[PDB]
Amino acid sequence: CVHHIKRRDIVLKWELGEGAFGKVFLAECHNLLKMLVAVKALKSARQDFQREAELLTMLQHQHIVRFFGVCTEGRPLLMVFEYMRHGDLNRFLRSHGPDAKLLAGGEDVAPGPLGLGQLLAVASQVAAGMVYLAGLHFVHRDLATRNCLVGQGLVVKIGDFGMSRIYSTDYYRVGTMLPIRWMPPESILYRKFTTESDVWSFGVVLWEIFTYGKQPWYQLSNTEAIDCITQGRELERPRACPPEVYAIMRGCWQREPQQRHSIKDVHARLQALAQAHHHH
Numbered sequence: 001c002v003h004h005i006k007r008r009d010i011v012l013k014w015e016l017g018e019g020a021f022g023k024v025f026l027a028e029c030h031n032l033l034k035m036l037v038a039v040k041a042l043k044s045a046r047q048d049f050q051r052e053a054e055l056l057t058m059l060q061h062q063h064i065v066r067f068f069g070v071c072t073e074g075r076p077l078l079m080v081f082e083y084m085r086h087g088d089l090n091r092f093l094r095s096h097g098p099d100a101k102l103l104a105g106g107e108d109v110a111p112g113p114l115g116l117g118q119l120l121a122v123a124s125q126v127a128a129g130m131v132y133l134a135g136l137h138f139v140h141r142d143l144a145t146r147n148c149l150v151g152q153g154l155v156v157k158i159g160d161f162g163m164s165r166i167y168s169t170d171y172y173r174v175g176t177m178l179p180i181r182w183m184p185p186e187s188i189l190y191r192k193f194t195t196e197s198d199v200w201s202f203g204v205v206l207w208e209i210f211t212y213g214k215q216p217w218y219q220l221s222n223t224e225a226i227d228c229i230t231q232g233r234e235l236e237r238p239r240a241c242p243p244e245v246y247a248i249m250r251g252c253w254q255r256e257p258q259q260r261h262s263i264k265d266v267h268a269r270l271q272a273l274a275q276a277h278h279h280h
């Protein structure tokens with residue numbers, strides 16, 4: 001079922017970044033539809049790549065980054081994805097925040113912070129991707145803005161760099177890299193990962209969106225953040241966050257996993273708020 005792509009049809013442009021087990025390149029792909037694509041090159045490694053390819057071929061949704069296939073005939077092994085021009089959502093939020101004008105290039109279009117409508121549109125799209133994954137009983141385990149991508153026209157989709165571990169500071173070593181600031185108490189304490197720990201992570205993503213990409217618990221060390229989370233401390237309402245949006249975050253952050261609101265209900269509430277603000 002996995003689509004295969006000839007090595008001749010992939011023209012590497014430049015290396016975007018690299019991690020311990022992979023390198024990501026911007027490339028052009030021929031006879032796929034010239035087309036820009038993001039290519040992951042693998043540094044057992046195989047079989048894990050094969051399971052990954054099968055999984056990415058089955059995950060198909062408007063808010064999941066598009067996977068086009070693999071290149072296995074030759075070395076290294078390649079995975080081909082659509083190119084998301086505006087990069088990862090954490091960097092996107094940080095570059096479209098209150099200090100956007102200071103950071104902007106001279107030619108940037110209408111520099112300034114994203115407005116409420118745009119922030120709800122980002123939030124609703126991430127929630128839609130999570131509704132799809134929950135429907136498949138798929139647990140992401142690392143939902144965070146660094147793992148979402150932004151395309152032209154404020155199109156937001158869920159991904160997973162794997163190599164996120166630029167963002168090494170967002171993970172804590174115990175003893176495996178865990179994104180503790182995005183995790184609920186049961187995941188930090190017992191590594192219990194479920195659709196309910198993903199909804200908790202979505203509440204944290206909502207907080208990152210409304211703080212224009214700040215790191216959750218930024219004032220705290222990893223050990224201090226683990227202690228705050230397990231003690232039940234809640235992140236502060238962001239200045240740009242309306243009370244209705246903070247109530248949605250609180251619904252994702254109920255201590256008992258079974259008490260957390262479903263991602264379908266969270267998505268429905270964000271869509272309703274986005275609809276109510278469209279003309280205002």
Ligand SMILES: O=C(Nc1ccc(OC(F)(F)F)cc1)N(Cc1cccc(-c2nccs2)c1)C1CC1
Binds near residue numbers: 039040064084087158
């Ligand atoms: O996000 C991924 N991979 C990935 C996707 C989906 C997925 O399914 C799940 F459900 F978990 F979401 C799992 C893993 N990337 C990053 C990625 C992809 C596409 C474009 C871009 C860029 N375009 C511009 C600057 S960077 C980057 C791969 C490492 C390549």
Ligand SMILES: [Cl-]
Binds near residue numbers: 246247250
């Ligand atoms: Cl509330």
